[PDB]
Write an enzyme that holds these catalytic residues in place. Structure first.
Site, mmCIF file in Angstrom:
data_model
loop_
_atom_site.group_PDB
_atom_site.id
_atom_site.type_symbol
_atom_site.label_atom_id
_atom_site.label_comp_id
_atom_site.label_asym_id
_atom_site.label_seq_id
_atom_site.Cartn_x
_atom_site.Cartn_y
_atom_site.Cartn_z
ATOM 1 C CB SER A 18 -8.458 -42.864 0.272
ATOM 2 O OG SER A 18 -7.242 -42.760 0.881
ATOM 3 C CB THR A 41 -0.946 -46.586 3.347
ATOM 4 O OG1 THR A 41 -1.881 -45.531 3.790
ATOM 5 C CG2 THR A 41 0.099 -45.829 2.227
ATOM 6 C CB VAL A 67 4.968 -44.195 -2.581
ATOM 7 C CG1 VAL A 67 3.945 -44.444 -3.152
ATOM 8 C CG2 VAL A 67 5.047 -43.406 -0.940
ATOM 9 C CB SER A 133 2.736 -30.223 0.798
ATOM 10 O OG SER A 133 3.580 -31.480 1.154
ATOM 11 C CE1 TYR A 140 3.220 -25.147 0.025
ATOM 12 C CE2 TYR A 140 4.349 -22.769 0.015
ATOM 13 C CZ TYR A 140 3.770 -23.591 -0.597
ATOM 14 O OH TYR A 140 3.127 -23.206 -1.831
ATOM 15 C CB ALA A 142 12.385 -27.154 2.661
ATOM 16 C CB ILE A 173 -6.627 -26.807 -1.497
ATOM 17 C CG1 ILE A 173 -5.514 -26.617 -2.545
ATOM 18 C CG2 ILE A 173 -7.816 -27.565 -2.140
ATOM 19 C CD1 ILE A 173 -5.755 -25.398 -3.562
HETATM 20 N N1 LIG Z 1 18.328 -34.623 -6.505
HETATM 21 S S1 LIG Z 1 16.753 -34.291 -6.536
HETATM 22 O O1 LIG Z 1 16.300 -34.476 -7.709
HETATM 23 O O2 LIG Z 1 15.992 -34.920 -5.346
HETATM 24 C C1 LIG Z 1 16.812 -32.409 -6.235
HETATM 25 C C2 LIG Z 1 16.757 -31.529 -7.416
HETATM 26 C C3 LIG Z 1 16.914 -30.376 -7.412
HETATM 27 C C4 LIG Z 1 16.609 -29.634 -6.054
HETATM 28 N N2 LIG Z 1 16.862 -30.368 -5.116
HETATM 29 C C5 LIG Z 1 16.708 -31.752 -4.989
HETATM 30 N N3 LIG Z 1 16.884 -32.524 -3.900
HETATM 31 C C6 LIG Z 1 16.759 -32.015 -2.677
HETATM 32 C C7 LIG Z 1 17.014 -33.042 -1.757
HETATM 33 C C8 LIG Z 1 16.712 -32.824 -0.308
HETATM 34 C C9 LIG Z 1 16.605 -31.716 0.009
HETATM 35 C C10 LIG Z 1 16.403 -30.712 -0.771
HETATM 36 C C11 LIG Z 1 15.939 -29.442 -0.233
HETATM 37 F F1 LIG Z 1 14.676 -29.339 0.259
HETATM 38 F F2 LIG Z 1 16.880 -29.037 0.864
HETATM 39 F F3 LIG Z 1 15.901 -28.421 -0.925
HETATM 40 C C12 LIG Z 1 16.396 -31.010 -2.397
#
Ligand SMILES: NS(=O)(=O)c1cccnc1Nc1cccc(C(F)(F)F)c1
Ligand SMILES: NS(=O)(=O)c1cccnc1Nc1cccc(C(F)(F)F)c1
Ligand code: NI
Lengths: 230, 233, 229, 242
Positions: A18, A41, A67, A133, A140, A142, A173
């Protein structure tokens, strides 16, 4: 009417369409000739999407999608399948709180991806593209690492069916969020020395959706003017 | 998408991936200069371009020498204009070879930057090596890591002038090199690729084509892997 | 324990190098520290003595084959083969390349000795955080890759090759940055403090040990949580 | 009379999950050898009792306890039991596990919830002390197989980096150890051809010992590693597999 090296006659689903980056992705895909389904949403957001598509001559629809819920996802797809066909291009764009957010986002990515895969398996063709993001820093970084890994893992799971899975990691951006001293500070960290445009993200997504990117999968393309923060 | 009225230099353009990058760029409307290390290769490049209707030239370039590089650019400037799109395509080879190749990348890049600085516009795209034992793999992994780092660094050095620098890391592509690996080794690689098929040279060219475009103006310092889902560290 | 091991540490007259020299000595190695001048090499000897470390100060210029070869034969003759070697030594393109040549040059020289012993440790110290970003990032990427490649080439001989990537450490360079710029950096470091030279030395000490025999080709970042790529 | 001990983790209480065999046991014994009071955990009473008997046979002061990392009630209760009897655990090694289609997603995300759950519980104690060590052990090394391995490793690295940022200011380090091919009872019983195949991928040309993982953990637990946080130390003999 039959097609060659374009997105013509392809149905594309773009979540979070949107405003900002999602809207631009919706328009770029439409410009490349896809039938574009944009989602929001809320009902008012879904209506604004339909009116925006119409004003740019894009065939498609605005739809309400949440979602985060299995019922909303299943219902939305059956609706789309019934009226328009199977979506074979899907763009997922929809301090100390970093863990929950990232996890929640990944559950949604997974949930939606798994739903649209039956269609793509059947077609022996598909494109899944995840938008990360826009650039606190802990969240960011993580987010970005979860998105890369998720994209790499799903690509492996669905490669054999000729479905590519890719991600786009935008940098700074120009969107309504980011629109002084802090602004100049950021521009110093960006080699190109300028904010990116939403359309610049769309162009990359457009290319990834194409037949020219059939051998690209599991990749995360950073679109950040040279600013790398991990 | 349009590269109309742009002059593009592609090194190693006589076969395989280089040729396909030369043809894709031409197809997008650039004037294409392809290079080879021999006169017969340079002439085959000219004939290939002609057969596909691409305006351009075949030229002899040896990226390892300053005199060959300087002369080749002057020749191009004189006849066609400034190239603003440039595609760069016995103990301890993992050190010496790799470092020599990065000097070539650097040498060429530095030479073509004056032109791009003048224009306030440019594209530099580096193509890494294709996948193709024990001696093999250390070299392959050092090359790939040196290319990423080099690309990221140069992108930083020349960003402010609206020049993007990017790299393409191909995986297992169907080229004359890889057709003549032993079938056991070939089947081994197919097992490791999610898409379960070799990549085509044209699939690499498409990525390069996009990176050369105005649509990829905010992409720099990146290495785009084009490997059907096979990732190697 | 590194007792009865001879360890070579380049750039040992101040800062991180000195601390690595002292830490290794504290773990019982015979330590040879190097500097690019005679007065620096003397200061190294006096420092080692004040801390009760057996060893030597030596003049070494890592950029020259003659200086390297001569220095090793002198060490071999008087003290034995150095089996622990810490490279703490040495417009972005030329610099990084030069540094890697020195790394390579010195590593190749000391490998004969380690091959003979079927044992060795090579540890490379990357640069501290001070165009600024571009050199740092290129250096770091060249160091990781170099370390990873050499580890592969010399693994079978029970030689480990590793690297330490320091973050913001308190050394003479960083003591002279203006307090506003200092406080800015402290905001980017989770632990919210500069690292000490000794904190780098502790990691190197562990990497030199038998306990780290299965760790090779690694780069250990010692940066209080501040990460940059 | 009374014997003071001069060792690097003397007077620290360390919690090690999954301590009844293999790598967990070795981490428990290494930390004990460095002088910590060691609490090892298992998901059953009989496993917890075997941990106690092992610790005793090696002269390690500590305890075997029952812990299920997947439940808040089990975690909370176990900490309060430990704080009551032994003190606050300031060294915590997460080596307990997860699994019980898409395992590369569900398993991995479940494990990261356990890691987060436990870590958040033991942080109050470490905040209070202005000192702490959290160390996460990743998994030891098909096509689907490799997808899980790579997802796990990437999640562990990112998690570790993110938590380190969240708890840095309190002088708590958070780190991870990514083991490679380590020697265990399963791998001792593979046919020599399969064994030699693996050894071809590893520069050092040998399997790692459990104790080699423990040594790295031991160092990361120390005061010498106070500036190391957010790191993942690979201990894989040079086999770098993504
Ligand atoms: N299993 S997966 O495809 O979701 C996946 C594949 C590869 C790396 N991380 C994954 N998951 C993940 C889930 C929660 C937090 C984090 C964190 F941000 F801490 F790094 C990563
Ligand atoms: N061949 S090598 O072991 O020295 C090596 C192994 C792996 C990666 N880079 C290497 N070398 C290298 C040389 C010059 C510049 C760079 C750059 F920093 F630009 F990435 C890297
Ligand atoms: Ni003498």
């Amino acid at each position: 009417y039959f097609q060659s090296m374009s997105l013509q006659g392809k149905v594309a689903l773009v979540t979070g369409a949107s405003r900002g980056i999602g809207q631009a992705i919706a328009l770029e895909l439409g410009r490349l000739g896809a039938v574009v389904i944009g989602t929001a949403t809320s009902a008012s957001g879904a209506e604004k999407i339909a009116e925006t598509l119409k004003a740019n001559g894009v065939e498609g629809a605005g739809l309400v999608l949440d979602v985060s819920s299995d019922e909303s996802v299943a219902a939305t797809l059956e609706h789309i399948q019934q009226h328009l066909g199977q979506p074979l291009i899907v763009v997922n764009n929809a301090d100390d709180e970093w863990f929950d957010v990232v996890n929640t986002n990944l559950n949604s990515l997974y949930r939606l991806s798994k739903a649209v895969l039956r269609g793509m398996t059947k077609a022996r063709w598909g494109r899944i593209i995840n938008i990360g993001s826009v650039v606190g820093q802990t969240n960011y970084a993580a987010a970005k690492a979860g998105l890369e890994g998720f994209t790499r893992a799903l690509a492996r799971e669905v490669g054999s069916r000729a479905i590519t899975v890719n991600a786009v990691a935008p940098g700074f951006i120009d969107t309504d969020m980011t629109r002084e001293a802090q602004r100049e500070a950021l521009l110093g960290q960006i080699p190109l020395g300028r904010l990116g445009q939403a359309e610049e993200i769309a162009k990359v997504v457009g290319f990834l959706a194409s037949d020219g990117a059939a051998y690209v999968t599991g990749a995360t393309v950073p679109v950040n003017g040279g600013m790398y923060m991990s």
